[PDB]
Each structure stands twice: as structure tokens, then as C-alpha cells.
Short mmCIF file of all heavy atoms in Angstrom, two decimals:
data_model
loop_
_atom_site.label_atom_id
_atom_site.label_comp_id
_atom_site.label_asym_id
_atom_site.label_seq_id
_atom_site.Cartn_x
_atom_site.Cartn_y
_atom_site.Cartn_z
N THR C 1 -66.25 -60.40 -8.13
CA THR C 1 -66.73 -59.08 -8.51
C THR C 1 -66.03 -57.90 -7.86
O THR C 1 -65.78 -57.91 -6.65
CB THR C 1 -68.21 -58.92 -8.24
OG1 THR C 1 -68.85 -60.21 -8.21
CG2 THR C 1 -68.77 -58.12 -9.37
N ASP C 2 -65.69 -56.91 -8.70
CA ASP C 2 -64.97 -55.68 -8.35
C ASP C 2 -65.43 -55.22 -6.94
O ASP C 2 -64.58 -55.17 -6.06
CB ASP C 2 -65.16 -54.63 -9.46
CG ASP C 2 -64.34 -54.97 -10.73
OD1 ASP C 2 -63.10 -55.14 -10.62
OD2 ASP C 2 -64.93 -55.08 -11.82
N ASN C 3 -66.69 -54.91 -6.66
CA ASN C 3 -67.05 -54.56 -5.28
C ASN C 3 -68.22 -55.39 -5.00
O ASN C 3 -68.65 -56.09 -5.90
CB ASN C 3 -67.30 -53.07 -5.04
CG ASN C 3 -68.69 -52.57 -5.48
OD1 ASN C 3 -69.76 -53.19 -5.35
ND2 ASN C 3 -68.65 -51.29 -5.83
N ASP C 4 -68.75 -55.29 -3.79
CA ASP C 4 -69.82 -56.14 -3.30
C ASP C 4 -71.26 -55.74 -3.56
O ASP C 4 -72.16 -56.60 -3.51
CB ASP C 4 -69.62 -56.33 -1.80
CG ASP C 4 -70.05 -57.70 -1.33
OD1 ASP C 4 -71.26 -57.88 -1.10
OD2 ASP C 4 -69.18 -58.58 -1.18
N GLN C 5 -71.47 -54.50 -3.99
CA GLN C 5 -72.82 -54.00 -4.26
C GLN C 5 -73.14 -54.42 -5.67
O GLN C 5 -74.31 -54.65 -6.06
CB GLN C 5 -72.87 -52.46 -4.15
CG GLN C 5 -72.42 -51.87 -2.82
CD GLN C 5 -72.06 -50.38 -2.92
OE1 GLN C 5 -72.01 -49.81 -4.01
NE2 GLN C 5 -71.80 -49.76 -1.77
N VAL C 6 -72.06 -54.60 -6.41
CA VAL C 6 -72.14 -55.17 -7.71
C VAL C 6 -72.65 -56.59 -7.59
O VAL C 6 -73.59 -57.00 -8.29
CB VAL C 6 -70.80 -55.23 -8.36
CG1 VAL C 6 -70.99 -55.81 -9.73
CG2 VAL C 6 -70.22 -53.84 -8.46
N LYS C 7 -72.01 -57.33 -6.69
CA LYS C 7 -72.33 -58.72 -6.46
C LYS C 7 -73.82 -58.77 -6.22
O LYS C 7 -74.53 -59.52 -6.88
CB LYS C 7 -71.58 -59.30 -5.28
CG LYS C 7 -71.70 -60.80 -5.19
CD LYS C 7 -71.10 -61.32 -3.91
CE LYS C 7 -70.81 -62.80 -4.04
NZ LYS C 7 -70.12 -63.31 -2.83
N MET C 8 -74.25 -58.00 -5.23
CA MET C 8 -75.67 -57.92 -4.91
C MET C 8 -76.57 -57.74 -6.16
O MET C 8 -77.57 -58.44 -6.34
CB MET C 8 -75.91 -56.77 -3.93
CG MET C 8 -75.60 -57.12 -2.49
SD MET C 8 -76.47 -58.57 -1.88
CE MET C 8 -75.08 -59.63 -1.48
N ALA C 9 -76.15 -56.83 -7.05
CA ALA C 9 -76.92 -56.55 -8.28
C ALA C 9 -77.02 -57.76 -9.22
O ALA C 9 -78.09 -58.07 -9.77
CB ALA C 9 -76.33 -55.37 -9.02
N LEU C 10 -75.89 -58.45 -9.36
CA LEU C 10 -75.84 -59.67 -10.17
C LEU C 10 -76.72 -60.74 -9.59
O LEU C 10 -77.47 -61.39 -10.32
CB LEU C 10 -74.40 -60.17 -10.24
CG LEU C 10 -73.45 -59.26 -11.00
CD1 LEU C 10 -72.03 -59.71 -10.86
CD2 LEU C 10 -73.87 -59.52 -12.42
N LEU C 11 -76.62 -60.93 -8.28
CA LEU C 11 -77.45 -61.91 -7.62
C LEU C 11 -78.93 -61.61 -7.89
O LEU C 11 -79.71 -62.53 -8.18
CB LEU C 11 -77.15 -61.89 -6.12
CG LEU C 11 -75.75 -62.40 -5.76
CD1 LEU C 11 -75.32 -61.87 -4.40
CD2 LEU C 11 -75.69 -63.91 -5.79
N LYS C 12 -79.29 -60.32 -7.88
CA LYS C 12 -80.67 -59.93 -8.20
C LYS C 12 -81.06 -60.28 -9.63
O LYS C 12 -82.18 -60.78 -9.88
CB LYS C 12 -80.87 -58.43 -7.97
CG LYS C 12 -82.25 -57.94 -8.36
CD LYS C 12 -82.30 -56.42 -8.42
CE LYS C 12 -83.62 -55.94 -9.01
NZ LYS C 12 -83.73 -54.46 -8.98
N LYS C 13 -80.15 -60.07 -10.58
CA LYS C 13 -80.47 -60.33 -11.97
C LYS C 13 -80.67 -61.83 -12.14
O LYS C 13 -81.67 -62.26 -12.71
CB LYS C 13 -79.41 -59.77 -12.93
CG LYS C 13 -79.51 -58.25 -13.09
CD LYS C 13 -80.98 -57.82 -13.08
CE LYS C 13 -81.16 -56.31 -13.19
NZ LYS C 13 -80.65 -55.78 -14.49
N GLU C 14 -79.70 -62.62 -11.68
CA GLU C 14 -79.79 -64.08 -11.71
C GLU C 14 -81.13 -64.58 -11.17
O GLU C 14 -81.86 -65.28 -11.88
CB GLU C 14 -78.65 -64.70 -10.90
CG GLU C 14 -78.52 -66.21 -11.05
CD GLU C 14 -78.09 -66.62 -12.44
OE1 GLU C 14 -78.96 -66.77 -13.32
OE2 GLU C 14 -76.87 -66.77 -12.66
N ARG C 15 -81.45 -64.21 -9.93
CA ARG C 15 -82.69 -64.66 -9.31
C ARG C 15 -83.87 -64.30 -10.22
O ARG C 15 -84.73 -65.15 -10.48
CB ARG C 15 -82.90 -64.09 -7.90
CG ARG C 15 -84.11 -64.73 -7.20
CD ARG C 15 -84.37 -64.23 -5.77
NE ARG C 15 -83.18 -64.27 -4.93
CZ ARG C 15 -82.78 -65.35 -4.27
NH1 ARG C 15 -83.47 -66.48 -4.34
NH2 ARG C 15 -81.67 -65.30 -3.53
N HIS C 16 -83.88 -63.06 -10.71
CA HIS C 16 -84.98 -62.56 -11.53
C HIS C 16 -85.17 -63.40 -12.78
O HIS C 16 -86.29 -63.78 -13.15
CB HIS C 16 -84.69 -61.10 -11.91
CG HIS C 16 -85.69 -60.50 -12.85
ND1 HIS C 16 -85.47 -60.43 -14.21
CD2 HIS C 16 -86.90 -59.93 -12.63
CE1 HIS C 16 -86.51 -59.85 -14.79
NE2 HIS C 16 -87.39 -59.54 -13.85
N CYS C 17 -84.04 -63.73 -13.41
CA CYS C 17 -84.03 -64.51 -14.64
C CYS C 17 -84.56 -65.92 -14.41
O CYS C 17 -85.30 -66.46 -15.24
CB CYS C 17 -82.61 -64.57 -15.20
SG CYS C 17 -82.33 -65.85 -16.43
N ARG C 18 -84.21 -66.50 -13.27
CA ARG C 18 -84.68 -67.86 -12.99
C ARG C 18 -86.18 -67.85 -12.69
O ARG C 18 -86.92 -68.75 -13.13
CB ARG C 18 -83.89 -68.47 -11.84
CG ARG C 18 -82.41 -68.31 -12.07
CD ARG C 18 -81.74 -69.61 -12.46
NE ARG C 18 -80.30 -69.54 -12.25
CZ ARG C 18 -79.70 -69.69 -11.07
NH1 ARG C 18 -80.41 -69.92 -9.97
NH2 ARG C 18 -78.39 -69.60 -11.00
N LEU C 19 -86.62 -66.84 -11.96
CA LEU C 19 -88.03 -66.75 -11.58
C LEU C 19 -88.84 -66.61 -12.86
O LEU C 19 -89.90 -67.23 -13.01
CB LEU C 19 -88.29 -65.57 -10.64
CG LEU C 19 -89.76 -65.18 -10.41
CD1 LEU C 19 -90.50 -66.30 -9.71
CD2 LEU C 19 -89.85 -63.89 -9.60
N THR C 20 -88.33 -65.83 -13.80
CA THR C 20 -89.14 -65.47 -14.94
C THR C 20 -89.12 -66.60 -15.97
O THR C 20 -90.14 -66.89 -16.62
CB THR C 20 -88.68 -64.12 -15.57
OG1 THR C 20 -89.73 -63.57 -16.37
CG2 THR C 20 -87.41 -64.29 -16.41
N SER C 21 -87.99 -67.30 -16.06
CA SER C 21 -87.93 -68.53 -16.84
C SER C 21 -88.89 -69.58 -16.30
O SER C 21 -89.52 -70.32 -17.07
CB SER C 21 -86.50 -69.08 -16.86
OG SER C 21 -85.58 -68.08 -17.24
N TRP C 22 -89.08 -69.58 -14.99
CA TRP C 22 -89.91 -70.61 -14.38
C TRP C 22 -91.36 -70.27 -14.67
O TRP C 22 -92.16 -71.15 -15.02
CB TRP C 22 -89.65 -70.71 -12.88
CG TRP C 22 -90.55 -71.68 -12.21
CD1 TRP C 22 -90.35 -73.02 -12.07
CD2 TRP C 22 -91.80 -71.40 -11.58
NE1 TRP C 22 -91.39 -73.59 -11.39
CE2 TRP C 22 -92.30 -72.61 -11.07
CE3 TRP C 22 -92.55 -70.23 -11.39
CZ2 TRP C 22 -93.51 -72.70 -10.39
CZ3 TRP C 22 -93.75 -70.32 -10.71
CH2 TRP C 22 -94.22 -71.54 -10.22
N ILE C 23 -91.71 -68.99 -14.50
CA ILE C 23 -93.08 -68.58 -14.70
C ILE C 23 -93.43 -68.93 -16.14
O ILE C 23 -94.54 -69.39 -16.44
CB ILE C 23 -93.30 -67.08 -14.44
CG1 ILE C 23 -93.12 -66.77 -12.95
CG2 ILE C 23 -94.68 -66.66 -14.88
CD1 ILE C 23 -93.25 -65.30 -12.62
N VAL C 24 -92.46 -68.73 -17.03
CA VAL C 24 -92.72 -69.01 -18.43
C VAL C 24 -92.93 -70.52 -18.62
O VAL C 24 -93.79 -70.94 -19.41
CB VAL C 24 -91.57 -68.51 -19.35
CG1 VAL C 24 -91.67 -69.12 -20.75
CG2 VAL C 24 -91.56 -66.98 -19.41
N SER C 25 -92.22 -71.33 -17.82
CA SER C 25 -92.44 -72.78 -17.82
C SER C 25 -93.88 -73.12 -17.49
O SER C 25 -94.48 -74.01 -18.10
CB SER C 25 -91.50 -73.49 -16.84
OG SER C 25 -90.16 -73.06 -16.97
N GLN C 26 -94.44 -72.41 -16.51
CA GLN C 26 -95.80 -72.69 -16.05
C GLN C 26 -96.86 -72.23 -17.04
O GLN C 26 -97.70 -73.02 -17.46
CB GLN C 26 -96.06 -72.07 -14.68
CG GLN C 26 -94.97 -72.34 -13.68
CD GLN C 26 -94.75 -73.83 -13.48
OE1 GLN C 26 -95.64 -74.54 -12.99
NE2 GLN C 26 -93.58 -74.32 -13.86
N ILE C 27 -96.81 -70.96 -17.41
CA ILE C 27 -97.83 -70.40 -18.31
C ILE C 27 -97.73 -70.96 -19.73
O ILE C 27 -98.67 -70.80 -20.52
CB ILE C 27 -97.74 -68.87 -18.36
CG1 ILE C 27 -96.43 -68.44 -19.02
CG2 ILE C 27 -97.82 -68.29 -16.96
CD1 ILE C 27 -96.28 -66.94 -19.13
N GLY C 28 -96.61 -71.59 -20.05
CA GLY C 28 -96.32 -72.08 -21.39
C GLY C 28 -97.46 -72.64 -22.24
O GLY C 28 -97.82 -72.07 -23.27
N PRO C 29 -98.04 -73.78 -21.81
CA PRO C 29 -99.17 -74.38 -22.54
C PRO C 29 -100.43 -73.52 -22.65
O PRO C 29 -101.05 -73.53 -23.71
CB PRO C 29 -99.46 -75.64 -21.74
CG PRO C 29 -98.87 -75.40 -20.38
CD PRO C 29 -97.63 -74.62 -20.67
N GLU C 30 -100.83 -72.83 -21.57
CA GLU C 30 -101.96 -71.88 -21.61
C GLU C 30 -101.86 -70.97 -22.84
O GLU C 30 -102.77 -70.88 -23.69
CB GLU C 30 -101.99 -71.05 -20.32
CG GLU C 30 -103.27 -70.24 -20.12
CD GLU C 30 -103.10 -69.19 -19.05
OE1 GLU C 30 -102.04 -69.16 -18.40
OE2 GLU C 30 -104.03 -68.38 -18.85
N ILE C 31 -100.70 -70.34 -22.95
CA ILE C 31 -100.50 -69.30 -23.94
C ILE C 31 -100.39 -69.97 -25.29
O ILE C 31 -101.02 -69.53 -26.23
CB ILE C 31 -99.25 -68.45 -23.65
CG1 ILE C 31 -99.37 -67.74 -22.30
CG2 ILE C 31 -99.03 -67.43 -24.76
CD1 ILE C 31 -100.63 -66.92 -22.17
N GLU C 32 -99.59 -71.04 -25.39
CA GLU C 32 -99.47 -71.76 -26.66
C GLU C 32 -100.84 -72.18 -27.23
O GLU C 32 -101.05 -72.16 -28.44
CB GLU C 32 -98.56 -72.99 -26.50
CG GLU C 32 -97.09 -72.72 -26.82
CD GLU C 32 -96.13 -73.55 -25.99
OE1 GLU C 32 -96.61 -74.41 -25.21
OE2 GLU C 32 -94.90 -73.37 -26.13
N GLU C 33 -101.76 -72.57 -26.34
CA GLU C 33 -103.15 -72.85 -26.71
C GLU C 33 -103.78 -71.59 -27.31
O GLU C 33 -104.43 -71.62 -28.39
CB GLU C 33 -103.93 -73.31 -25.47
CG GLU C 33 -104.56 -74.69 -25.56
CD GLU C 33 -105.49 -74.86 -26.74
OE1 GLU C 33 -106.63 -74.36 -26.67
OE2 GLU C 33 -105.08 -75.50 -27.73
N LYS C 34 -103.55 -70.48 -26.63
CA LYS C 34 -104.17 -69.22 -27.04
C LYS C 34 -103.63 -68.78 -28.42
O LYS C 34 -104.38 -68.24 -29.23
CB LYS C 34 -103.97 -68.13 -25.99
CG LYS C 34 -104.79 -68.39 -24.73
CD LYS C 34 -104.71 -67.25 -23.75
CE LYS C 34 -105.97 -67.20 -22.90
NZ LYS C 34 -107.17 -66.83 -23.72
N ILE C 35 -102.35 -69.03 -28.66
CA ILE C 35 -101.71 -68.69 -29.93
C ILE C 35 -102.27 -69.62 -31.00
O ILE C 35 -102.49 -69.20 -32.14
CB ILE C 35 -100.17 -68.85 -29.86
CG1 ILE C 35 -99.56 -67.90 -28.82
CG2 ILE C 35 -99.52 -68.68 -31.23
CD1 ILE C 35 -98.07 -68.08 -28.60
N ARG C 36 -102.49 -70.88 -30.64
CA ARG C 36 -103.15 -71.84 -31.53
C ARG C 36 -104.47 -71.28 -32.05
O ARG C 36 -104.79 -71.43 -33.23
CB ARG C 36 -103.40 -73.19 -30.87
CG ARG C 36 -102.86 -74.36 -31.70
CD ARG C 36 -103.24 -75.71 -31.11
NE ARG C 36 -102.97 -75.81 -29.68
CZ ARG C 36 -101.76 -75.79 -29.13
NH1 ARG C 36 -100.68 -75.70 -29.90
NH2 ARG C 36 -101.63 -75.88 -27.82
N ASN C 37 -105.24 -70.62 -31.18
CA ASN C 37 -106.59 -70.21 -31.60
C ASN C 37 -106.75 -68.78 -32.13
O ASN C 37 -107.79 -68.46 -32.70
CB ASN C 37 -107.58 -70.38 -30.44
CG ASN C 37 -107.48 -71.75 -29.81
OD1 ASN C 37 -107.33 -72.75 -30.50
ND2 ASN C 37 -107.56 -71.79 -28.48
N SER C 38 -105.75 -67.93 -31.95
CA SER C 38 -105.81 -66.56 -32.47
C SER C 38 -106.01 -66.54 -33.99
O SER C 38 -105.50 -67.40 -34.70
CB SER C 38 -104.55 -65.81 -32.11
OG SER C 38 -103.48 -66.36 -32.85
N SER C 39 -106.74 -65.53 -34.48
CA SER C 39 -106.93 -65.33 -35.92
C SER C 39 -106.34 -64.02 -36.43
O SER C 39 -106.67 -63.56 -37.52
CB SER C 39 -108.42 -65.38 -36.25
OG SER C 39 -109.02 -66.53 -35.69
N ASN C 40 -105.46 -63.43 -35.63
CA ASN C 40 -104.98 -62.07 -35.85
C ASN C 40 -103.51 -62.09 -35.49
O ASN C 40 -103.14 -62.62 -34.44
CB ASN C 40 -105.80 -61.04 -35.05
CG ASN C 40 -105.09 -59.69 -34.88
OD1 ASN C 40 -103.96 -59.61 -34.40
ND2 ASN C 40 -105.78 -58.62 -35.28
N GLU C 41 -102.66 -61.54 -36.35
CA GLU C 41 -101.21 -61.64 -36.18
C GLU C 41 -100.67 -60.79 -35.02
O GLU C 41 -99.79 -61.23 -34.28
CB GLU C 41 -100.53 -61.22 -37.49
CG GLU C 41 -101.05 -61.94 -38.74
CD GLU C 41 -100.03 -62.88 -39.36
OE1 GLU C 41 -99.56 -63.81 -38.67
OE2 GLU C 41 -99.70 -62.69 -40.55
N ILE C 42 -101.20 -59.58 -34.86
CA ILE C 42 -100.70 -58.66 -33.85
C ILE C 42 -100.98 -59.19 -32.44
O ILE C 42 -100.16 -59.04 -31.51
CB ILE C 42 -101.34 -57.24 -33.97
CG1 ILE C 42 -101.44 -56.74 -35.42
CG2 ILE C 42 -100.62 -56.25 -33.07
CD1 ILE C 42 -102.58 -57.34 -36.27
N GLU C 43 -102.12 -59.86 -32.30
CA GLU C 43 -102.46 -60.56 -31.08
C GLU C 43 -101.46 -61.67 -30.76
O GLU C 43 -101.02 -61.80 -29.62
CB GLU C 43 -103.89 -61.13 -31.18
CG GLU C 43 -104.33 -61.99 -30.01
CD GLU C 43 -105.73 -62.57 -30.20
OE1 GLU C 43 -106.01 -63.17 -31.25
OE2 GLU C 43 -106.56 -62.41 -29.28
N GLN C 44 -101.09 -62.44 -31.78
CA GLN C 44 -100.05 -63.45 -31.63
C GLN C 44 -98.74 -62.85 -31.15
O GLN C 44 -98.10 -63.39 -30.25
CB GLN C 44 -99.80 -64.19 -32.94
CG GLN C 44 -100.92 -65.09 -33.39
CD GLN C 44 -100.67 -65.73 -34.75
OE1 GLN C 44 -99.57 -66.18 -35.05
NE2 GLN C 44 -101.70 -65.76 -35.58
N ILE C 45 -98.36 -61.72 -31.74
CA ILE C 45 -97.15 -61.01 -31.33
C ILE C 45 -97.21 -60.69 -29.84
O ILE C 45 -96.26 -60.93 -29.07
CB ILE C 45 -96.99 -59.70 -32.14
CG1 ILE C 45 -96.78 -60.01 -33.62
CG2 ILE C 45 -95.87 -58.84 -31.56
CD1 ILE C 45 -96.88 -58.81 -34.53
N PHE C 46 -98.39 -60.24 -29.41
CA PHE C 46 -98.59 -59.93 -28.01
C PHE C 46 -98.41 -61.19 -27.15
O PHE C 46 -97.67 -61.17 -26.16
CB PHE C 46 -99.96 -59.29 -27.80
CG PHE C 46 -100.29 -59.02 -26.37
CD1 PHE C 46 -99.73 -57.94 -25.71
CD2 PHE C 46 -101.17 -59.84 -25.68
CE1 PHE C 46 -100.03 -57.69 -24.39
CE2 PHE C 46 -101.47 -59.59 -24.36
CZ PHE C 46 -100.90 -58.52 -23.71
#
């Protein structure tokens, strides 16, 4: 990377992306259940 503060920024994005992919791994079935039972499209979108 061109300079090192950049590096720092990338490292932050990477970490953030992994954390959020993981959280999505955990909440996955909870929400999928909820989508299974919704009767309203906009709620599903949410």
C-alpha cells in the first residue's frame, strides 16, 4: 500500500467485513425463520 495509514484503513475494512459476515452466520436461522412467517412484503425486505 502507497502509505501506511491507508494500510490501517484497509485492515479496518477487512476486519469489519469478517465480523459482519460472522454475525450474519449466527443470526442467519433466526431471521430466516422470521422471513418464513412474515405475511407482508415490506417487512421481508427489512
Side-chain angles (χ1 to χ4, degrees):
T1 337
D2 287 304
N3 80 39
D4 214 278
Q5 303 161 353
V6 181
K7 191 188 199 175
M8 279 305 119
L10 293 172
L11 292 158
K12 177 193 171 176
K13 284 323 178 63
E14 189 68 274
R15 188 179 309 276
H16 175 262
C17 164
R18 310 254 199 79
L19 167 64
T20 199
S21 309
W22 176 87
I23 292 177
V24 166
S25 312
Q26 312 302 295
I27 67 179
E30 192 195 354
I31 299 306
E32 268 148 4
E33 240 303 283
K34 290 186 152 293
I35 298 175
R36 233 186 311 294
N37 311 320
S38 69
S39 310
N40 161 305
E41 308 248 58
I42 317 78
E43 175 182 51
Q44 291 176 42
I45 296 169
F46 176 77

